[PDB]
């Protein structure tokens, strides 16, 4: 089609895409123009099914959503597949009359490849609404990291820690789901390295706040350090989750 | 997921590919 974005919108789509690239080729090379094509009545028909639930549970979501984006863009995916579905409807009506219909042939390859399109697209048009929320919960932990600076007492850190502990897990687990699926192998090694560096830094932000909080009046140089770690910890776990979402939105061709 | 009703899709549009190559 060529290459799908996920694994699972790879599983769903790459046979019939792949099974439509050799009908292509068929047609361009005029294979099957010498024989009688059977009638295609039932299986259009079973096509054309498939289109109306198609459309009717996508139009419900249309509906049945506060997600703006995703409003706007599926509805073109309706339309695409409606098109081709009426090419494949023709094409049965003109194989009844005569087997040997050219324009019924251009019908079947230019309505198979509409299908095929629209699915494509409603699937990416899902997918885009899953990856915003995903990138929803990194901007959440951009956010509480911007507030490690008005830490100040043991308790405001205790509160810090249990706040910000259990969100890394989560952005942990989602990306680490989301990296599974990918098709591209790049995009994963990206992925799966910036979680890792985030990681790797969260205990070396809660040490150096920790010190601020602890010595804050003392006034010891570990102070003054601690407060250059917590900056610099801050600014790299902050470059790497905008590297997450940047990453999370590529892309490829 | 609308995985049903797009695998459903895919697989009619596979059965009626293969019935114009048969």
């Given at each position: 089609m060529p290459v799908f974005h996920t694994r699972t919108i790879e599983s769903i789509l790459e046979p019939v895409a792949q099974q439509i690239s050799h009908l292509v080729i068929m047609h361009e090379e005029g294979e099957v123009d010498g024989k009688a094509i059977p009638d295609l009545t039932a299986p259009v028909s079973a096509v054309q099914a498939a289109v109306s639930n198609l459309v009717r549970v996508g139009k419900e979501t249309v509906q049945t959503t506060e997600d703006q984006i995703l409003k706007r863009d599926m509805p073109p995916a309706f339309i695409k597949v409606e098109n081709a579905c009426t090419k494949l409807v023709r094409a049965a009506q003109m194989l009844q009359a005569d087997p040997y219909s050219v324009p019924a042939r251009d019908y079947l390859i230019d309505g198979s490849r509409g299908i095929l399109s629209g699915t494509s697209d409603l699937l990416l048009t899902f997918d885009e609404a899953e990856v915003r929320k995903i990138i929803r919960v990194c901007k959440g932990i951009l956010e509480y990291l911007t507030?490690?600076?008005?830490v100040e007492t043991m308790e405001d850190l205790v509160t810090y820690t249990k706040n910000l502990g259990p969100g890394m897990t989560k952005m942990a687990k989602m990306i680490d789901e989301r990296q599974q699926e990918l098709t591209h192998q790049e995009h994963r090694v990206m992925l799966v390295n910036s979680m890792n560096t985030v990681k790797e830094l969260l205990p070396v932000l809660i040490s150096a706040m920790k010190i601020f909080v602890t010595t804050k009046n003392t006034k010891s140089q570990g102070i003054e350090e601690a407060l250059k770690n917590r900056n610099f910890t801050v600014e790299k776990m902050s470059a790497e989750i905008n590297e997450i979402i940047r990453v999370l939105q590529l892309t490829s061709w | 997921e609308m995985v049903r009703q797009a695998r459903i899709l895919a697989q009619a549009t596979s059965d009626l590919v293969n019935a114009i190559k048969a």
């Open positions: 507030v490690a600076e008005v | -």
